Design an enzyme around this catalytic site. Structure first.
Site, mmCIF file in Angstrom:
data_model
loop_
_atom_site.group_PDB
_atom_site.id
_atom_site.type_symbol
_atom_site.label_atom_id
_atom_site.label_comp_id
_atom_site.label_asym_id
_atom_site.label_seq_id
_atom_site.Cartn_x
_atom_site.Cartn_y
_atom_site.Cartn_z
ATOM 1 N N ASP A 246 26.832 45.634 65.542
ATOM 2 C CA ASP A 246 28.476 44.932 65.934
ATOM 3 C C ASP A 246 28.201 43.897 66.810
ATOM 4 O OD1 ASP A 246 31.035 44.474 65.928
ATOM 5 O OD2 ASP A 246 31.350 46.612 65.612
ATOM 6 N N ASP B 64 12.078 43.916 68.970
ATOM 7 C CA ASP B 64 12.256 44.784 67.884
ATOM 8 C C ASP B 64 11.140 45.682 67.751
ATOM 9 O OD1 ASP B 64 12.783 46.132 65.355
ATOM 10 O OD2 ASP B 64 12.444 44.359 64.193
ATOM 11 N N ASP C 240 11.820 46.232 61.454
ATOM 12 C CA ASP C 240 12.811 46.361 60.256
ATOM 13 C C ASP C 240 13.847 45.312 60.508
ATOM 14 O OD1 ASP C 240 13.468 47.761 62.522
ATOM 15 O OD2 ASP C 240 14.064 49.568 61.369
ATOM 16 N N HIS D 15 30.045 45.864 61.910
ATOM 17 C CA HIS D 15 31.376 45.894 62.464
ATOM 18 C C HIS D 15 32.250 46.815 61.220
ATOM 19 C CE1 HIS D 15 34.986 45.482 64.759
ATOM 20 N NE2 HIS D 15 35.614 44.911 63.349
ATOM 21 N N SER E 245 37.675 49.953 64.660
ATOM 22 C CA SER E 245 37.772 48.685 65.652
ATOM 23 C C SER E 245 38.983 48.815 66.186
ATOM 24 C CB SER E 245 37.644 47.456 64.687
ATOM 25 O OG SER E 245 36.692 47.615 63.954
HETATM 26 O O1 LIG Z 1 39.780 45.576 64.443
HETATM 27 C C1 LIG Z 1 39.115 44.796 64.440
HETATM 28 O O2 LIG Z 1 38.020 44.486 63.408
HETATM 29 C C2 LIG Z 1 38.606 43.821 65.584
HETATM 30 C C3 LIG Z 1 39.476 43.863 66.915
HETATM 31 C C4 LIG Z 1 39.386 43.148 68.027
HETATM 32 C C5 LIG Z 1 40.728 42.890 68.737
HETATM 33 C C6 LIG Z 1 40.709 42.074 69.873
HETATM 34 C C7 LIG Z 1 39.548 41.329 70.224
HETATM 35 O O3 LIG Z 1 39.577 40.514 71.176
HETATM 36 C C8 LIG Z 1 38.270 41.284 69.191
HETATM 37 C C9 LIG Z 1 38.287 42.350 68.153
HETATM 38 CA CA LIG Z 2 13.244 48.135 64.827
#
Ligand SMILES: O=C(O)/C=C/c1ccc(O)cc1
Ligand SMILES: [Ca+2]
Ligand SMILES: *[C@@H]1O[C@H](CO)[C@@H](O[C@@H]2O[C@H](CO)[C@@H](O[C@@H]3O[C@H](CO[C@H]4O[C@H](CO[C@H]5O[C@H](CO)[C@@H](O)[C@H](O)[C@@H]5O[C@H]5O[C@H](CO)[C@@H](O)[C@H](O)[C@@H]5O)[C@@H](O)[C@H](O[C@H]5O[C@H](CO)[C@@H](O)[C@H](O)[C@@H]5O)[C@@H]4O)[C@@H](O)[C@H](O[C@H]4O[C@H](CO)[C@@H](O)[C@H](O)[C@@H]4O[C@H]4O[C@H](CO)[C@@H](O)[C@H](O)[C@@H]4O[C@H]4O[C@H](CO)[C@@H](O)[C@H](O)[C@@H]4O)[C@@H]3O)[C@H](O)[C@H]2NC(C)=O)[C@H](O)[C@H]1NC(C)=O
Ligand SMILES: *[C@@H]1O[C@H](CO)[C@@H](O[C@@H]2O[C@H](CO)[C@@H](O[C@@H]3O[C@H](CO[C@H]4O[C@H](CO[C@H]5O[C@H](CO)[C@@H](O)[C@H](O)[C@@H]5O[C@H]5O[C@H](CO)[C@@H](O)[C@H](O)[C@@H]5O)[C@@H](O)[C@H](O)[C@@H]4O)[C@@H](O)[C@H](O)[C@@H]3O)[C@H](O)[C@H]2NC(C)=O)[C@H](O)[C@H]1NC(C)=O
Ligand SMILES: *[C@@H]1O[C@H](CO)[C@@H](O)[C@H](O)[C@H]1NC(C)=O
Length: 503
Positions: A372, A230, A238, A412, A161
């Site tokens: 995510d 899906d 799934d 995420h 992230s």
């Molecule tokens: O590191 C993370 O879990 C999320 C980061 C993030 C930073 C700025 C945003 O606008 C959205 C997600």
């Molecule tokens: Ca599927």
């Protein structure tokens, strides 16, 4: 270890303490900011915990730790951060040490989950954008040398992230720091991500606004996404979209009829789902950021919920407009444009030219969970295509040093309902071989020259942390698509093939 406390002399660095910690111990973080997580972590191996303070300028500084294993492979690992923090990822530092990496992590230049320290303090911004991970790696490598009596063999980075953006900032702008990088769900195109994330509250409006969807209304949309996208597009019901690129969701399927008010969307709510599952464009038709893909429900409710989004709101207030009264309610194109133009220390992290990283022989495993809803996985395949166009390299040329894995049914950095556990961290830990663990896959690529073709993920029985494998799947490197053979048990990885039509 005890003595290292006094012998270790690093430039601009105060060593607070050293600490022998044996395999098994619940290390506790009593000075961790209240907002920081976790409050403790287990080390599975015996380490020297080194806690430093590092001055980066007149009013900016890091907290850095090194966890140095008694059984050292020769490897160095840097970890990275999350959100707008602020917090050492101790679970990742423990993860690294546990495999015999000499592992470092810094707090990214401030303490806690708020970016308020960035306000009127560009040195704290500079540490967030690049200078914390970079500096931690330089000093990390220095002190690793001084503790063991020789130089590390290979240099690795692991992050997700914000930490994935940090990995890419290293490949792009500090190519010599690392021989291997795992960059997960990266917050790259960071100003566009803040614009994207902020835009959702302007699109939905507040609770009770005609445009707004409650959490239960969003879950109804997501159920109807699986109806449209899906089984009809991947053949396996799934609840997992194997390739969301094939999914253009039609929210009009849920339109309220004459006097229906329940279990349906109004006209304004249909516009809201079209915008959220649509791209963001701005002044003079300039492209800002992709849609949130349909099916990407994991973390969805953070930026798209009952109040403004903190990360974007603080960015606009503290870093872009330098105005603590900037209002998240009136976010719009002038905001998206200003963020792109201010772009502190090139935090965009959108450089397509990986010449130097490629040329020195460094390798990057990029990966993103398709479920995510906090960082669009679409932004990751746009970066891959940007690299291909900028460098003039086909996917088979890029395969030599940069692979990007689309992980279906992963959220995420962890969670999701699919075969998500690919080994990027403890929370998402599956097996402990190169084929099913992305950190070992990176070691094997850098050290043996054996690139990952696929990365294996698993789900355990009942979505538990461990046990009997219920689902296993070899996630495909872009632009390959995972295709079910139409005959085998969908839970068996042998029932699937990564496919890339050439004729
Ligand atoms: O590191 C993370 O879990 C999320 C980061 C993030 C930073 C700025 C945003 O606008 C959205 C997600
Ligand atoms: Ca599927
Ligand atoms: C709140 O407080 C804050 C703290 O004080 C304060 O912040 C400071 O704000 C100012 C702006 O007001 C910041 O200054 C700008 O910094 C930008 C970022 O520079 C970093 O990153 C870029 C890389 O980013 C671009 O490129 C990559 C690809 O490589 C893309 O992925 C990125 O999206 C991004 O591209 C967008 O913008 C590009 C322009 O650079 C476009 O060309 C592109 O198409 C994209 O649209 C690096 O290049 C920078 O490196 C250079 O500078 C560092 C030193 O900083 C050097 O060490 C290094 O060697 C490099 O030389 C850096 O890392 C800059 O983008 C931005 O640049 C423009 O403005 C300056 C003039 O001030 C020009 O000289 C420069 O040429 C750029 O001009 C283009 O864009 C502007 C509008 O932004 C146009 O007006 C101008 O016409 C020009 O456009 C035309 O030509 C272009 C080609 O030349 C063309 O492409 C365009 O289409 C167009 O025709 C500028 O320097 C400063 O960094 C902040 N400081 C800090 C510490 O944060 C803030 O303002 C306060 N808030 C307020 C007051 O509200
Ligand atoms: C962001 O967040 C980070 C953390 O995530 C913050 O970093 C933390 O920052 C603070 C600084 O503000 C650090 O605190 C310093 O730690 C030094 C070491 O502390 C350790 O040792 C202390 C002293 O221990 C001895 O003496 C005491 C009494 O004074 C005895 O009770 C004890 O038994 C010890 O005796 C031994 O030594 C004495 C001689 O001193 C002998 O006489 C004895 O025989 C015996 O040998 C102790 O107080 C403490 O518990 C620790 O064990 C310390 O020197 C200094 O005063 C200060 O407290 C944290 O270390 C640091 N943590 C980490 C992980 O980095 C950061 O500040 C924040 N940043 C920002 C900008 O806000
Ligand atoms: C570290 O930087 C912060 C933010 O400007 C500041 O409050 C603190 O005084 C600095 N620490 C030192 C010891 O200079």
């Amino acid at each position: 270890c005890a003595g290292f406390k006094t012998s270790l002399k690093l430039p601009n660095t105060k060593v607070w303490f050293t600490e022998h910690v044996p395999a098994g111990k619940n290390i506790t973080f009593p000075d961790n900011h209240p907002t920081c997580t976790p409050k403790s972590t287990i080390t599975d191996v015996e380490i020297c915990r080194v806690a430093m303070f590092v001055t980066t300028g007149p009013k900016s500084n890091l907290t850095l730790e090194a966890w140095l294993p008694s059984n050292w492979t020769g490897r160095f690992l840097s970890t990275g951060n999350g959100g707008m923090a602020g917090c050492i990822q101790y679970d990742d530092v423990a993860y690294g040490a546990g495999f015999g990496f000499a592992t470092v992590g810094a707090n990214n230049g401030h303490n806690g989950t708020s970016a308020v320290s960035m306000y009127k303090n560009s040195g704290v911004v500079e540490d967030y954008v690049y200078r914390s991970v970079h500096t931690g790696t330089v000093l990390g490598k220095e002190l690793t040398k001084k503790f063991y009596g020789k130089k590390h063999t290979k240099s690795y980075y692991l992050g997700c992230s914000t930490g994935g953006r940090q990995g890419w900032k290293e490949a792009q702008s500090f190519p010599d720091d690392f021989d291997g990088i795992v960059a997960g769900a990266p917050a790259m195109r960071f100003n566009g991500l803040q614009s994207r994330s902020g835009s959702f509250w302007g699109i939905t409006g507040p609770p009770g606004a005609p445009t707004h969807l409650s959490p239960e209304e969003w879950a109804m949309v997501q159920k109807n996404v699986l109806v449209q996208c899906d089984e009809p597009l991947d053949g396996v019901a799934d609840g997992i979209l194997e390739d969301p690129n094939l999914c253009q969701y039609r929210p009009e399927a849920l339109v309220c009829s004459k006097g229906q008010t329940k279990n349906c969307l109004t006209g304004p709510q249909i516009e809201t789902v079209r915008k959220v599952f649509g791209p963001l464009y701005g002044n003079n038709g300039t492209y800002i950021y992709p849609r949130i893909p349909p099916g990407a429900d994991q973390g969805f409710g953070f930026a798209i919920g009952e109040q403004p989004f903190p990360y974007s709101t603080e960015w606009f207030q503290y870093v872009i407009w330098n105005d603590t009264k900037w209002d998240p309610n009136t976010i719009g194109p002038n905001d998206y444009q200003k963020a792109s133009e201010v772009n502190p220390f090139n935090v965009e992290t959108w450089e397509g030219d990986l010449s130097k990283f490629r040329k020195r022989g460094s390798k990057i495993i990029h990966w993103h969970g398709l479920e995510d809803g906090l960082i669009s996985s679409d932004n990751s395949m746009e970066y891959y295509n940007h690299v291909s166009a900028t460098m003039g390299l086909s996917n088979t040329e890029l395969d030599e040093f940069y692979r990007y894995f689309r992980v279906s049914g992963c959220g995420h950095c962890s969670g999701g309902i699919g075969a998500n556990r690919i080994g990027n961290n403890r929370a998402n830990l599956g097996g402990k071989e190169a084929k099913n663990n992305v950190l070992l896959a990176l070691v094997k690529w850098v050290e043996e020259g054996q690139a990952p073709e696929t990365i294996t993920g698993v789900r355990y029985v009942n979505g538990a942390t461990t046990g009997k494998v219920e689902v296993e799947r070899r996630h495909c490197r872009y632009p390959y698509r995972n295709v079910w053979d139409r005959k085998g048990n969908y839970k068996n990885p042998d029932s699937w093939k990564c496919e890339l039509p050439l004729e």
